Amino acid sequence: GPGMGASQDDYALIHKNILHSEDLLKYILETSVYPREHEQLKGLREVTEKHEWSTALVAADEGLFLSMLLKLMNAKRTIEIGVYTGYSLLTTALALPEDGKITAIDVNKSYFEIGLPFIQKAGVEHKINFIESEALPVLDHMLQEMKEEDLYDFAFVDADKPNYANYHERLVKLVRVGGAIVYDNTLWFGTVAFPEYPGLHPEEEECRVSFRNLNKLLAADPRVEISQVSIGDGLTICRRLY
């Protein structure tokens, strides 16, 4: 209701990790990520860690892994659902070739404007088509208009977690055969391992349930092959088979 509003401080899980210690995560970041992180990504990360929804920011080691996947599969056209301040978006734009194209969807353009100066300074703003909207209507609009020549190589899904299964029904048609769909946060702070988990915020409990259902759905889906990867907060890579 009326008041000051929602805080990540209201959330039970924001201090949780899936790795065995903070020291191991910090080792990975300092040894293997920060020396390889573009200066503009570093700047965008540092301002975002002061933001009120900083817990949503994609992990920097996960960022380098997404970049690696994009380059190894020679992706050119991608879609991103859930932009926030733009860390995964700038990661993707830096990884794609000069003529790469990204369709980036987020309900809140004000977050994107936080990262836009870093994206501009990195010289890759020209690859991004940002759409301010709930993602489901955009995807449904694409599906009546897109042709085979416009299919995406890669999709990164990092928006409202309870809608992932609904996004999946559209994305297995919008990503090419042999293309990849990556769902972020599919281990949800480790809570998915438990049929009950005490003391969660109502929205956190909704995601625990939705990810437990989604992980079963993806594992059963004959239209894709999958790999769930314990990096960041967990992600699941899907590769479209037909």
Ligand X SMILES: Nc1ncnc2c1ncn2[C@@H]1O[C@H](CSCC[C@H](N)C(=O)O)[C@@H](O)[C@H]1O
Chain residues binding a copy of itself by CB under 8 A are 17-21, 23-28, 31-33, 35-36, 61, 64-65, 67-69, 71-73, 178, 180, 187, 190, 192-194, 215-216, 218-220, 225-231, 236-237, 239
106 binds Mg ion (CB under 5 A): no
Neighbours of 44 (CB within 10 A): 27
185 binds Mg ion (CB under 5 A): yes
166 binds ligand X (CB under 6 A): no
Tell how far CA 226 is from the center of its chain. Answer: 16
Tokens, residue 225: 């092959």
Choices 2-10, 94-102, 105-113, 225-233 (CB under 6 A): range interacting with ligand X: 105-113
Q: What is the DSSP letter of 98?
A: T
Binding partner of residue 185 among ligand X, Mg ion, a copy of itself, none, CB cut-off 5 to 8 Å per kind: Mg ion
Choices 35-43, 44-52, 164-172, 183-191 (CB under 5 A): range interacting with Mg ion: 183-191
Residue from 13, 104, 116, 135 binding ligand X (CB under 6 A): 135
CA–CA separation, 52 and 27 (whole Å): 26
CA–CA separation, 153 and 28 (whole Å): 29
The 3-state DSSP class for residue 203 equals helix
CA–CA separation, 131 and 111 (whole Å): 13
